[PDB]
Amino acid sequence: MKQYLELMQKVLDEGTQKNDRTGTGTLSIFGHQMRFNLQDGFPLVTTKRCHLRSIIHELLWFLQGDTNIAYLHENNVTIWDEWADENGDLGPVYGKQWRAWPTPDGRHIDQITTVLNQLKNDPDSRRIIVSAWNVGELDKMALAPCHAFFQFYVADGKLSCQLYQRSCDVFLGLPFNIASYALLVHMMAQQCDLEVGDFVWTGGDTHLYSNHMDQTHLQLSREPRPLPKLIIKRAPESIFDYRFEDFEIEGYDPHPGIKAPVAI
Amino acid sequence: MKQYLELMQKVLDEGTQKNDRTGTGTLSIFGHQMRFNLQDGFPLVTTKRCHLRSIIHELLWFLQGDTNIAYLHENNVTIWDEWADENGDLGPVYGKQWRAWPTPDGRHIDQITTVLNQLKNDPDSRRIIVSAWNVGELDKMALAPCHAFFQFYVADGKLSCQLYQRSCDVFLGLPFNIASYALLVHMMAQQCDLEVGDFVWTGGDTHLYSNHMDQTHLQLSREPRPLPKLIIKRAPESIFDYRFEDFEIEGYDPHPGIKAPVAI
Ligand SMILES: C#CCN(Cc1ccc2[nH]c(N)nc(=O)c2c1)c1ccc(C(=O)N[C@@H](CCC(=O)O)C(=O)O)cc1
Ligand SMILES: C#CCN(Cc1ccc2[nH]c(N)nc(=O)c2c1)c1ccc(C(=O)N[C@@H](CCC(=O)O)C(=O)O)cc1
Ligand SMILES: *c1cc(=O)[nH]c(=O)n1[C@H]1C[C@H](O)[C@@H](COP(=O)(O)O)O1
Ligand SMILES: *c1cc(=O)[nH]c(=O)n1[C@H]1C[C@H](O)[C@@H](COP(=O)(O)O)O1
Distance CA A133, CA A10 (A): 27
Instruction: Tell me, using a 6 A CB cutoff, whether residue B167 lines ligand 4.
Output: yes
Stated length of chain B:
264
Q: For A126-213, where are the E strands, in sequence order?
A: 129-131, 147-154, 158-169, 195-209
Distance CA A207, CA B155 (A): 12
**In chain A, residues 167-186 whose CB comes closer than 8 Å to chain B:** 167
Distance CA B9, CA B176 (A): 19
Nearest protein Cα to ligand 3, atom 1 = A146
With vertex at residue A80, the alpha carbon angle to CA A174 and CA B163, rounded to the nearest 5 degrees, is 40
What are the respective helix, strand and coil percentages of chain A, to the nearest 5? 35, 25, 40
Nearest CB to A35; choose among B28, B31, B103: B31
Experimental approach taken? X-ray
User: What chain B residue is nearest to A144 in terms of C-alpha separation?
Assistant: B127
Distance CA B234, CA A127 (A): 39
Candidates A22, A144, A261, A158; CA nearest to B124 is: A22
Does B160 touch chain A if contact means CB atoms closer than 8 Å? yes
Q: Residue B46 in 3-state DSSP?
A: coil
Candidates B236, B123, B250; CA nearest to B190 is: B236
First to last CA, chain B: 27
What does the DSSP 8-state code read for residue B126? S
Distance CA A189, CA A180 (A): 14
Contact assessment for residue A212 and residue A28, using Cβ atoms and an 8 Å cutoff: no
How close is the nearest chain A Cα to the Cα of B40, in Å?
A: 18
How close is the nearest chain A Cα to the Cα of B21, in Å?
A: 7
Measured over the CA atoms of residue A45, residue A175, residue A125 and residue B36, the dihedral's sign is negative
Contact assessment for residue B59 and residue B95, using Cβ atoms and an 8 Å cutoff: no
Distance CA A42, CA A250 (A): 10
What does the DSSP 8-state code read for residue B48? S
Distance CA B210, CA B22 (A): 11
Distance CA B101, CA B134 (A): 8
Candidates A73, A98, A97, A103; CA nearest to A188 is: A98
Q: For B122-177, where are the E strands, in sequence order?
A: 129-131, 147-154, 158-169
β-pairing verdict for A195-209 and A158-169: parallel
Distance CA A245, CA A76 (A): 15
Distance CA B112, CA B130 (A): 7
- B139-168 core/surface letters (b: 16 or more CB in 10 A; e: else): eebbebbbbbbbbbbbbeebbbbbbbbbbb
With vertex at residue A103, the alpha carbon angle to CA A102 and CA A106, rounded to the nearest 5 degrees, is 90
Q: A264 pairs with which residues across the strands? A: none
Instruction: Tell me, using a 6 A CB cutoff, whether residue B263 lines ligand 2.
Output: yes
Q: How many helices (H) and strands (E) does chain A have?
A: 7, 10
10 Å Cβ neighbour count for B203?
A: 28
The residue range of the domain holding A203 is: 1-264
- The CATH number of residue A75's host domain is 3.30.572.10
Candidates A254, A249, A251, A248; CA nearest to A225 is: A254
The maximal CA–CA distance of chain A, rounded, in angstroms, is: 55
Task: Report the Cα B141 to chain-centroid distance in Å.
Answer: 18
10 Å Cβ neighbour count for B238?
A: 10
- Ligand 1 centre to CA of B149 (Å) is 25
**Residue B21 to residues A122, B85, B174, Cα–Cα distance (Å):** 9, 19, 19
Q: What is the CA radius of gyration of chain B?
A: 18
Distance CA B87, CA B142 (A): 12
Q: How many domains does chain B have?
A: 1
Q: For chain A, where are the E strands, in sequence order?
A: 16-18, 26-37, 101-102, 108-109, 129-131, 147-154, 158-169, 195-209, 229-232, 247-250
Contact assessment for residue B155 and residue A16, using Cβ atoms and an 8 Å cutoff: yes
